[PDB]
Design a protein around this ligand. Structure first.
Ligand SMILES: [Cl-]
Ligand SMILES: [Cl-]
Length: 162
């Protein structure tokens, strides 16, 4: 298992514009296009991102390229955030993947906000981090995905994904 496989499972793959759990236009493997409620706006963003006139449909290769870029960016955002970086550096490989998953999903500003869970994670108090993590809108809104990530932090293994 790895970060790409992990996200592909949490996000799925859709080759045609769709609305994510929040009602926003997305495409591919969770690539958010826009928060605007307008499909044209979404399409326009999609075109700009792909580099061609898409008509709201992309290919698999295209979806995968957006994904790599997105994973790369989530990694780079973590490394550049004063709050996330030292946590990530302190973690083992599996757990770093769990962190990248969260950032991919919520953006780094959103994750940097879990002051308490981040401190617990850095101190290696897995169960305390897990309980805190669960007290969040994130967990209440997308509970199955949240539980998968929280378990990964708690255990340090890929069990929730096998
Ligand atoms: Cl883009
Ligand atoms: Cl969910």
């Amino acid at each position: 298992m790895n970060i790409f496989e992990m996200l592909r499972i949490d996000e799925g793959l859709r080759l045609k514009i769709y609305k994510d759990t929040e009602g926003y236009y997305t495409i591919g493997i969770g690539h958010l296009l826009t928060k605007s409620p307008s499909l044209n706006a979404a399409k326009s963003e999609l075109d700009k991102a792909i580099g061609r006139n898409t008509n709201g449909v992309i290919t698999k290769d295209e979806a995968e390229k957006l994904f790599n870029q997105d994973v790369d960016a989530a990694v780079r955002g973590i490394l550049r955030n004063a709050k996330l970086k030292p946590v990530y550096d302190s973690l083992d490989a599996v757990r770093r993947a769990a962190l990248i998953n969260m950032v991919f999903q919520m953006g780094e500003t959103g994750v940097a906000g879990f002051a308490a869970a981040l401190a617990a994670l850095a101190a290696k108090r897995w169960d305390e981090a897990a309980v805190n993590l669960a007290k969040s809108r994130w967990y209440n809104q997308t509970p199955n995905r949240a539980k998968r990530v929280i378990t990964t932090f708690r255990t340090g293994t890929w069990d929730a994904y096998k």
